[PDB]
RNA sequence: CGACUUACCAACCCGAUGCAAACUGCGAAUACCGGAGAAUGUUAUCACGGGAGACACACGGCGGGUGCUAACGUCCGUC
RNA sequence: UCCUCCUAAAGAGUAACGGAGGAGCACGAAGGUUGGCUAAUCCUGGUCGGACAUCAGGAGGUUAGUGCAAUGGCAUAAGCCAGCUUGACUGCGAGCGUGACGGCGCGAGCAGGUGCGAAAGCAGGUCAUAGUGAUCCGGUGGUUCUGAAUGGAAGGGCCAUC
RNA sequence: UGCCUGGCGGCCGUAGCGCGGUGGUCCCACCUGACCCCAUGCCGAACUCAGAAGUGAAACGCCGUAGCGCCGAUGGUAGUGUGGGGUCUCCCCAUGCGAGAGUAGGGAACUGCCAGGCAA
């Protein structure tokens, strides 16, 4: 199962970040509408979220679910986090290879202020 | 690829009408084919493995991989991690052209032909069979090879049972004698 | 698809004795001559 | 105890050396690990010797 | 042909639930991991559990496998 | 001569016979022999009792044995000093607690059943009583 | 190349019955460790210093190994 | 002498010429990190091939495996595969466990300089528990520390090691 | 506020399996192609990129069903600390603690944060 394999892949990282006790930037990727979220160390609340599923961010990019979409979401999370106040975060692959859209989102985020 | 268009042209409709499914994807469809060659005699002479792999590359469109023994058994004098066979799995588009070569030029050239078997089903919808000699495929000139070893074929589809798998194969004008 | 590890997969036209001609991509080589095919055979 | 002990001598002029073990029957070639030399406080190549 | 034995390794729980410990103190000595490290608890190379912070030690059961965990709360 | 096959260990500790019997009810036949006393039965005693009943019933009905030795017992050879290791295994015994059902039987009249069990109990070292299958 | 029966041998499983110091999908009483509290006890506690003796133990109860669930036998745990 | 289980009486420890077995290693990778993967046993179809080679599907969920006997542990895998590598590093070390002692074990963290990863991070050998021998005497390399009138040297000391 | 959907958790079998039904407005999945990014110890299988035709088949979510797993009393029983007694290799009395298995029964979940669509 794709989901079961993915959860098994990301379990070690999630546990490592959980015991470390640090805010983590978690990204969920699908064939469309790449998501992104910021989670408190306790893991119970979401500091801020962004994605291409809402019209506020989906009204510019031609198509959601590409490199451009990842950069927009990656950038979008940036100023939101900077405005909120949190600066340092830990990136979570969530079992997605850090190659394409995931890398583009992270690259946009780190260059936008969320260094990690 | 030509039969893939043929499959997409009316065979899907033929499957649709006969089983009157609710949807279109319910019809069984082939996803991959697998070629096996359990040589077994690697112990006597491991050098022949390379050429045994070579001919499979002649029939197939890609390089085979050599499989290793799952475990060591004293009854066969084989140790764990020792190559004792090769296989090939082909899917996507290349499977279709190979399926042509099997169904058009290979089956007719069977020595002492009697008819393709129809009871060779695993019980879930997957078909398997074997061949005596390589010359059935055109890629053997009878002078560059001097071995009688055969090979095994196996086509797997998304059928939930044998009845639709047999019906789907029948749509491909299989002998089934 | 890996490079420079697979045999050449060029197209080639093959015809049999009963007048049926078809194009197939394989590793047969330069030319091919057949006598029977799917049809025109006592199967 | 076929495994026997060797000495790894730093490529630098310093006389510092490490001591380890190896099997000459299986791996007869020399050992060229890159280790830390505290006399010069740098990582340098260490060569096998008696 | 018997008569051989090994010196006892004095394993077991060294600090029990609800008693304060200093950082670096050994809590449990074990061969495997009968208890898994929790919060402010580190695991040694020999699966020894030691306190990484000063506080009260507590035991609990967590996870889908109901495996036992040792934590420390700064109290 | 009941005896296990390829037991895990040749020797085992003496242990104790405290406690109370578990198989205290008739489960297979219609009549049974219940153990009143506490002790151990050797394999030879079980065989002797079994032969006594089979002859008594004249191979009519069914016989069930509800006890197995599965416990080796050692014994030092004569003129051997104490020590020098555990003794060699000699015979196998079954520990019996009060209420244990030793033998069960079915397919014979109650009258003939009583004498058959009485003959068997005469060749056992523990007080026994006759019981009948109960309804639930 | 189809295929069939069985008065006869029997695997794996299902239902019932047991056994285990070196079996545990369960699990006490006590004991042990830590914290708070009252009373009681000639500080009964700990650390340091001076001086020792002792390191052949025995029986009884309880939990055992060994022996024959023999020994005023032998070897351990606790009083 | 050392290691594992039981005896051992639910903390630790606990004897017998009591009941069972092992060790005097191995590995420059079988170590470090990054990425990925998940067995045994059965059922059906299939050339040699046959109960037991390899292929496909299904039940199964770890009865597999874990370099070496046993116990405990291991899916975040400690199990299996591949890339890059030498942290199997130097000086320390709060605080603990264990011993009559000699001693043995665990260890966050700090400084220096490294490897893997985009990064958070991990790495002071190996899933852990056996694979080991005090002191004396002497050998090898470094270090003006000393060097018995002075300058050297011999010989000692210190450090690494046999 | 409600029916829904996705992510991150709490909690961990009353939460897990089996059978039947139900879902495409969004979301999710399958799905087309892959010259380029990326990968196959062979394979667009898996991973990754460019897409959205088609579809709810499979998977996933929800509902129903006890057919299993699971939870589970009260009472009794076993064992047991302390103090006594006996026909003492085992038991009994006073007091304290009190199982395991089984039985009646329960049971096919609950809950926090964020984001999106519909109706409000």
Swiss-Prot record, chain B:
Function: This is one of the proteins that bind and probably mediate the attachment of the 5S RNA into the large ribosomal subunit, where it forms part of the central protuberance. Its 5S rRNA binding is significantly enhanced in the presence of L18.
Top-level taxon: Bacteria
UniProt name for this protein: Large ribosomal subunit protein uL5
UniProt-listed GO biological process terms: cytoplasmic translation; ribosomal large subunit assembly; translation
Other remarks on this protein: Identified as a multicopy suppressor of the slow growth phenotype of an rsgA (yjeQ) deletion mutant.
SUBUNIT field: Part of the 50S ribosomal subunit; part of the 5S rRNA/L5/L18/L25 subcomplex. Contacts the 5S rRNA; cross-links to the P site tRNA. Forms a bridge to the 30S subunit in the 70S ribosome, contacting protein S13 and S19.
Repressor in keyword set: no
Family designation: Belongs to the universal ribosomal protein uL5 family.
Keywords: Acetylation, Ribonucleoprotein, Ribosomal protein, RNA-binding, rRNA-binding, tRNA-binding
GO molecular function: 5S rRNA binding; RNA binding; structural constituent of ribosome; tRNA binding
Swiss-Prot record, chain D:
Top-level division of the source organism's lineage: Bacteria
A GO molecular-function annotation: structural constituent of ribosome
This protein's record includes keyword Ribosomal protein: yes
Complex formation: Part of the 50S ribosomal subunit. Cross-links to the P and E site tRNAs.
Other noteworthy facts: Surface exposed on the 50S subunit.
Alphabetical list of Pfam families matching this protein: Ribosomal_L33
Keyword Ribonucleoprotein set for record: yes
Family, per entry: Belongs to the bacterial ribosomal protein bL33 family.
GO cellular component: cytoplasm; cytosol; cytosolic large ribosomal subunit
Protein name: Large ribosomal subunit protein bL33
InterPro entries (UniProt xref): Ribosomal_bL33, Ribosomal_bL33_CS, Ribosomal_bL33_sf, Ribosomal_zn-bd
Family matches, as PANTHER family: 54S RIBOSOMAL PROTEIN L39, MITOCHONDRIAL, LARGE RIBOSOMAL SUBUNIT PROTEIN BL33M
UniProtKB/Swiss-Prot annotation, chain E:
Gene Ontology BP annotations: assembly of large subunit precursor of preribosome; cytoplasmic translation; cytosolic ribosome assembly; positive regulation of ribosome biogenesis; regulation of cell growth; ribosomal large subunit assembly
GO cellular component terms given for this protein: cytoplasm; cytosolic large ribosomal subunit
Entry keywords, A to Z: Ribonucleoprotein, Ribosomal protein, RNA-binding, rRNA-binding, tRNA-binding
Alphabetical list of InterPro entries matching this protein: Ribosomal_bL27, Ribosomal_bL27_CS
GO molecular function: ribosome binding; rRNA binding; structural constituent of ribosome; tRNA binding
SUPFAM superfamilies (UniProt xref): Ribosomal L27 protein-like (SSF110324)
Signal peptide location: none
NCBIfam families: L27
Family indicated by similarity: Belongs to the bacterial ribosomal protein bL27 family.
Subunit structure and binding partners: Part of the 50S ribosomal subunit. Cross-links to the 23S rRNA. Cross-links to the A and P site tRNAs.
Name of the protein described by the UniProt record: Large ribosomal subunit protein bL27
Organism whose genome encodes this protein: Escherichia coli (strain K12)
Gene: rpmA
UniProtKB/Swiss-Prot annotation, chain F:
Family membership noted in the UniProt record: Belongs to the universal ribosomal protein uL16 family.
Top-level taxon of origin: Bacteria
Protein name from the UniProt record: Large ribosomal subunit protein uL16
InterPro entries: Ribosomal_uL16 (IPR047873), Ribosomal_uL16_bact-type (IPR000114), Ribosomal_uL16_CS (IPR020798), Ribosomal_uL16_dom (IPR016180), Ribosomal_uL16_sf (IPR036920)
UniProt lineage: Bacteria, Pseudomonadati, Pseudomonadota, Gammaproteobacteria, Enterobacterales
MF-aspect GO terms: rRNA binding; structural constituent of ribosome; tRNA binding
Any one Gene Ontology BP term: cytoplasmic translation
Biological role: Binds directly to 23S ribosomal RNA and is located at the A site of the peptidyltransferase center. It contacts the A and P site tRNAs. One of the last ribosomal proteins to be assembled in the 50S subunit. The simultaneous presence of uL16 and bL36 probably triggers ObgE's GTPase activity and eventual dissociation from the mature 50S ribosmal subunit. It has an essential role in subunit assembly.
Record PTM: Is hydroxylated on Arg-81 by RoxA. The modification is nearly suppressed when E.coli is grown in anoxia.
Modified residues (N-methylmethionine): 1
């Amino acid at each position: 199962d794709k989901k079961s394999a993915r959860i098994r892949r990301a379990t070690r990282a999630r546990r490592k970040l959980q015991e470390l006790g640090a805010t983590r930037l978690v990204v969920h990727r699908t064939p469309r509408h790449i998501y992104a979220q910021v989670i408190a160390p306790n893991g119970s609340e979401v500091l801020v979220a962004a994605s291409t599923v809402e019209k506020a961010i989906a009204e510019q990019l031609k198509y959601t679910g590409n490199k451009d979409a990842a950069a927009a979401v990656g950038k979008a999370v940036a100023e939101r986090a900077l405005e909120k106040g949190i600066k340092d975060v830990s990136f979570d692959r969530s079992g997605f290879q850090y190659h394409g859209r995931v890398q583009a989102l992270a690259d946009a985020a780190r260059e936008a202020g969320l260094q990690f | 690829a030509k039969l893939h268009d043929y499959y997409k042209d009316e065979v899907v409709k033929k499957l649709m009408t006969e089983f009157n499914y609710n949807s279109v994807m319910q019809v069984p469809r082939v996803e991959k084919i697998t070629l096996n060659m359990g040589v077994g005699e690697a112990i006597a002479d491991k050098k022949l493995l390379d050429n045994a792999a070579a001919d499979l590359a002649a029939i197939s469109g890609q390089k085979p991989l050599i499989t290793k023994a799952r475990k060591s058994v004293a009854g066969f004098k084989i140790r764990q991690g020792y190559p004792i066979g090769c296989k090939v799995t082909l899917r996507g588009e290349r499977m279709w052209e190979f399926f042509e070569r099997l169904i058009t030029i290979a089956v007719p050239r069977i020595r002492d032909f009697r008819g393709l078997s129809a009871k060779s089903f695993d019980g879930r919808g997957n078909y398997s069979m074997g061949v005596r000699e390589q010359i059935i495929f055109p890629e053997i000139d009878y002078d560059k090879v001097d071995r009688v070893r055969g090979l095994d074929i196996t086509i797997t589809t998304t059928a939930k049972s044998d009845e639709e798998g047999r019906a789907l194969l029948a749509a491909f004008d299989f002998p089934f004698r | 698809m890996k490079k420079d590890i697979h045999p050449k997969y060029e197209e080639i036209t093959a015809s049999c004795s009963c007048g049926n001609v078809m194009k197939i991509r394989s590793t047969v080589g330069h030319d091919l001559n057949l006598d029977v095919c799917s049809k025109c055979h006592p199967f | 105890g076929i495994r026997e002990k060797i000495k790894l001598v730093s490529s630098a002029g310093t006389g510092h050396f490490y001591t380890t073990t190896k099997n000459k029957r299986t791996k007869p070639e020399k050992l060229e690990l890159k280790k830390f030399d505290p006399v010069v406080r740098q990582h340098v190549i260490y060569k096998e010797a008696k | 042909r018997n008569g051989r034995d090994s010196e006892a390794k004095r394993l077991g729980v060294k600090r029990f639930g609800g008693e304060s410990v200093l950082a670096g103190s050994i809590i449990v000595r074990q061969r495997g991991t009968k208890f898994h490290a929790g919060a402010n608890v580190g695991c040694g190379r020999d699966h020894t559990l030691f306190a990484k912070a000063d506080g009260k030690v507590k035991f609990e059961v967590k996870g889908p496998k109901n495996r036992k965990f040792i934590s420390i709360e700064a109290e | 001569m009941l005896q296990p096959k390829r037991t895990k260990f040749r020797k085992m500790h003496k242990g104790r016979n405290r406690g109370l019997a578990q198989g205290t009810d008739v489960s297979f036949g219609s009549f049974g022999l219940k153990a009143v006393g506490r002790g151990r039965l050797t394999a030879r005693q079980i065989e002797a009792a079994r032969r006594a009943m089979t002859r008594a019933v004249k191979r009519q009905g069914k016989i069930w044995i509800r006890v197995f030795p599965d416990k080796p017992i050692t014994e030092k050879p004569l003129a051997v000093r104490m020590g020098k290791g555990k003794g060699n295994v000699e015979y196998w015994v079954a520990l019996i607690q009060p209420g244990k059902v030793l033998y069960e039987m079915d397919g014979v009249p109650e009258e003939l059943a009583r004498e058959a069990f009485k003959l068997a109990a005469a060749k056992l070292p523990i007080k026994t009583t006759f019981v009948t299958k109960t309804v639930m």
